[PDB]
């Protein structure tokens, strides 16, 4: 079967639509997400046109093998989508209405700069390659683009599912390619990060600062060193849930900065002890009293600077 | 093959049933579970009807390709179910009795608010899309809905497997869809959480409280800081087995609250030492003696408040 | 093709056999194991019977499509088995001899009460569903039930592979079902648990008991608290290799009991220090001297009680 | 269908091309990467040649079954590629233009010597096995070799995708094999390693060196031993992300060398304490004062030597 | 299609060969490895014999369906191999030359006694089951047994790939089975274990021995207990990479023995402190001075004994 013959030198418009049924397994590290959706296709094939009076039927149902169907692919998929044809209906004017249900693992990169207070735009790229007989162009049928109400993505708020109506027409290996962009806007549910990572990390840091109210070097060493080890555990815990980025993330920035706070606290604890041994506790006391105000103030200001730079 | 022609303007009723054989791999983080079950289908096709006397046979067995079979799908599946037709029997009134054995990874969300003392309702949504010739409606044959006695779900008690008899008939992409809800009620076996997480977590917390019977700041610092690190390990252990929720879980609430108890214990340990150095041990003694009663009382009352709010 | 017509009202006996070739991947947490075996089937089809003199051949070889073959399934499988027909041989009397090689992931629950000194009975349930024309009953051909000598299951001793010769005949969805039970008896190789978990766990516990020969509260706090953290690591290590059980395991019981021993050791260490500060070291000495005998004696007796209750 | 008959004793040239669409899942430990690309093939089949005037058509489109297609395979793949034919076009002179879209898990070894400042050359080996009728040779059509702009590999910078135009023609099992080498040059994004591994590792090492400003053996023991445990955690973290190499990696060298620095710091801390107890603190002071300069100087010089040897 | 008819009562010899192309994913815990290789088969079918003069052709190429092909299987595979026929060539005398490219996950047990200085013999068992008409025997064509030069197994040195030329002919379910043994000899690249596990483990042990040059019980307790916890981390790290063995491994023996060294070091540290408190430091000094020589000497001798027993 050959594609529909053109009337004039016009290309064949294949109207598309994606209706999300299931959205799952957004792998942050792999920047992949799995989708289960309806893919609707519509085009005019004048060769399939019929008279409703003569034939008796209002619409004709065909099997995929029986008629010409456009070779529609996804750009950003790991493997070819798992699809099952639901219906093929032909109107008297030759307007074919195709519907299939598919599942695919979509590969869409994520921007972790504002993690875990980040928002993303997941993409689903529909593509058609033009044939030698005729050029094929994709279009969006806005009435057949949507999502089920029950569609949920664990740890994410699904904002919108829309399509960029004008396709990206380009040439690949001396043939026209018509690419459509389907955008699923999501925003992370940062809630859990607050009692699980952020507050426990702040608590251990604040515990290290109690060494500014102690003259016992042995106890101070235990305070700052133990809490630093807990901070290392939280840093390792955070980087397991995230991929290796060529940029600094919001959480990554905070975590890294906190290391400097532990390092300077060790220096303060060392200086205080050296001075006490040197029989200069008055100078040591001035440094410790200053540190009680300096450490929280510098921490608060540095965080304001970070939050400003990131948001 | 086209669907059965209607007598009047009535829709085609496809009687359904699901008999669970195997139930496994309930992934709490992924909110997925695997199922192996029998799917029974029954509908009337007057075109397949035949003579007992003339034909000789009581029932006719057909191969799936030979006759019209409704395109029955699952809504909440990752991929198309793995199915193998077991039997197709036609009565001579044209009543078709279809049976297939399938396996699928069902995507059903879970409510972790009361974890690990939570109960869930897993869903299996059966769906049929109406054709242009005729509208297809699903029905429940209660005699063909059940589960095997041997059906076990590791770490869960299987309560019931029932079906919501009235389908959710709606329009999707200008076509009628008949959706049925199959509900598998389960309840978590919380037993293991008590000797593995809850009691060990209480033991380390109670060990930190021994600092209220010690004047040794160095020993108290070691007691409260070490036990806090063990509590961090238990917090990390718990959040690995659970997904990131936009709400607080029962275990999550307790674990988070315990951090505040460690933080105030550090403050007490610090205050006590500062006062002793300041040659005010009488005031420090009053604070330590009060803490011996305050810490367990406030812990007990706060837990009563949490248990009340959650259950 | 229809099933063999009955002479009298007798059911069709399908003689079965399973010969294990490969046995692997016993997942303790998932209570699954993978199998690669031969499945032999034999039944009489009088319609396929022939004269050896007239036909010339002693046996006729058929392709699966050519003749009626019983729909044999496994009850406790995740998905339908991966099978490849090896041979189909028909004797002159119509006795069909079918052989296929299959692989499947069998779902069989395990009893962890005596872990790691536990033994299990893995099950493989063969099943046939009766047809409308005739009832099908399964039988065991003991000469075609066995296992290869090289069959090994990492960390397990394969004891026996036998079949319960009398089938469990029952009705499921108004049709007879003939179920056969194939039992693979295994026993865990507990050896590795001794130098890897049990002895290291005892060593750290015995190290904590050295605090009964020390008056240094600071050193005792470090001894009991550090060893308790190592015990937590061993508890976490053990529960990762095991699934969540609604009962107590042997190892689980020991591990949990050891927490109580650490808790009482902390109390002893606290009491001793409080008394010393109170200028009552004579009373503290009596308590410490008693603890030197009490702790190992109570530990030995409690373990005898546990071993008695569990074995 | 037999291959195209030769004019003279010349071999059949199959012009090839690979256009990368998706590049993902580079597993460092497994030395595997997944690819989704276009595979273009072109050869002359004089038997398929036609007159454009007589036939009417400029090009003829065939189904794969209809014509002879060369058996093209990948050398370094885990399993046979997942492919779907896109187009087969025959020119009047018999020049066949084949295009397929495929996905495969490519097995290409990596050189970790300079990790995480390493660059790699991933290989994709195309191969054709000669037939008895004729010898088949592969060629590169440089116009059909490329990559999509959006092609991204998490944690890597994609440098180039080129093909070694001259094939490696050799004999395997007494038949000619024509092998082509497609090279994907990548370079690691080392950025994240600096705030996540390198700096935290340096911070804990520098913290251990504060013991050179302390006379408190108990505090020094806590400083050097605790920081060493954190260094062990970083060593374990690094070797999980890497495979077992029969050579030393850059990061591996640094990490190993740092152990020696901790070991000598323990010796210094021990020597200092022994001398103080021996009532020789003047000699101990000379050793500690020297260590303050020796440790950072030897660390800086040793790192210069390592960086020189590795880069 | 039936097998080739015998001349005399001789069995049908199927000459085999395996040429390794890709060797990957050797899972130590699962005792599995993946293979991608060429499988060559050759047998004489007199029914396919032809005259080169009359037919014109020197060799005839057939499709697998057209002629009788022996049912060749692998014994030690997880699932049936993924195979794709490359060529089938028939010589005038009826000598068929079959070649296929396959991939399979081979299940071959490993001996960990000498780990990580162990060598293994991986097996690939080829098997053919005799038919009722004729008995089939396997043979090795040594000219078609080999491996590609580029064949690499991460963390292993590939020594040789040879075949045991004489098959293991036996009866299984009253039919002859001809089994061939293909052996891939490998030896572990132990290099990485030295700077990653062995030396760091020795360093922490040697650090614990510094307590023999200290009289500070509090510092000694910190030294021996902290290093013991690091040794536990290395023991856990080692047992994750290894399966549970009913025997002791070389590394397992060393690791276990080191626990005894830590235990006796705790006893020494305890005895020394008890004696000092008892105002007997002269006796304590004798014990500590002896331990300085005893501990390294006993460690060196015990390791010589272990190395002797294991190698
Ligand atoms: C030390 C701890 C630092 C915590 C920083 C607070 C988070 C923040 O400031 O994050 C900022 C986010 C971003 O939300 P957005 O809509 O994407 O901002 C886009 C705004 N533009 C368009 C102007 C750039 O705000 C929140 O989620 C606020 C609630 C989180 C509070 C958590 C407190 C703990
Ligand atoms: C600090 C530790 C806090 C532990 C709190 C106890 C658990 C609890 O109170 O959990 C509550 C669960 C809930 O069971 P439910 O049937 O769903 O209650 C639903 C009742 N409504 C419908 C009225 C709301 O009760 C149990 O499982 C009781 C046994 C567990 C005791 C474990 C003790 C340790
Ligand atoms: C503290 C450490 C406690 C260790 C308890 C020993 C194990 C035990 O007592 O386990 C008991 C097992 C069970 O073997 P069974 O044949 O299944 O007993 C069934 C007997 N009935 C049928 C009468 C009930 O005996 C062994 O494997 C003995 C060797 C293991 C010794 C390990 C020592 C370390
Ligand atoms: C202790 C910490 C030691 C850190 C050593 C610095 C890294 C280095 O020296 O790495 C070297 C890399 C190599 O880049 P290249 O192009 O492959 O060098 C090839 C050059 N030839 C052809 C001459 C051999 O340079 C970088 O990426 C420089 C930026 C990283 C700085 C990170 C500092 C922290
Ligand atoms: C405490 C640390 C103990 C380390 C023991 C050294 C390893 C050993 O002795 O291992 C022995 C291996 C075995 O090599 P093989 O050829 O299989 O010996 C077979 C010999 N027969 C046939 C005579 C039995 O030798 C090596 O790999 C030597 C190099 C490794 C040195 C690592 C040093 C650190
Ligand atoms: Cl696709
Ligand atoms: Cl363009
Ligand atoms: Cl074009
Ligand atoms: Cl489905
Ligand atoms: Cl099955
Ligand atoms: Cl391939
Ligand atoms: Cl096989
Ligand atoms: Na078509
Ligand atoms: Na059908
Ligand atoms: Na059949
Ligand atoms: Na072809
Ligand atoms: Na064949
Ligand atoms: Na300490």
Numbering used by the authors:
A (entry chain A), B (entry chain B), C (entry chain C), D (entry chain E), E (entry chain D): 5 to 315
The publication says:
At present, the best structurally characterized pLGIC is the G. violaceus ligand-gated ion channel (GLIC), of prokaryotic origin. Each subunit consists of an extracellular domain (ECD), predominantly in a β-sandwich fold, and a transmembrane domain (TMD) composed of four helices, labeled M1–M4. However, the GLIC is a pH-gated channel, activated by lowering the pH, with a maximal activation at pH 4 and a pH50 around 5. We instead found that proton activation is a complex multiple loci mechanism, with the key contribution stemming from the coupling interface between the extracellular and transmembrane domain, with E35 acting as a key proton-sensing residue.
In the lower part of the ECD, the principal (+) face also carries two acidic residues, E82 and D115. E82Q and D115N display significantly higher proton sensitivity than E82A and D115A, respectively. Assuming that Gln and Asn faithfully mimic protonated side chains of Glu and Asp, this would suggest that residues E82 and D115 are also proton sensors. To investigate this idea, the structures of E82Q and E82A were solved at pH 4. The E82A structure is similar to that of the Wt pH 4 structure, whereas that of E82Q shows a marked local reorganization of the Q82 moiety. A structural analysis was performed on E26Q, E26A, E35Q, E35A, E67A, E75A, E82Q, E82A, D86A, D88N, D88A, H127N, E181A, and H277Q mutants, by solving their structure at pH 4. All structures were in the apparently open conformation.
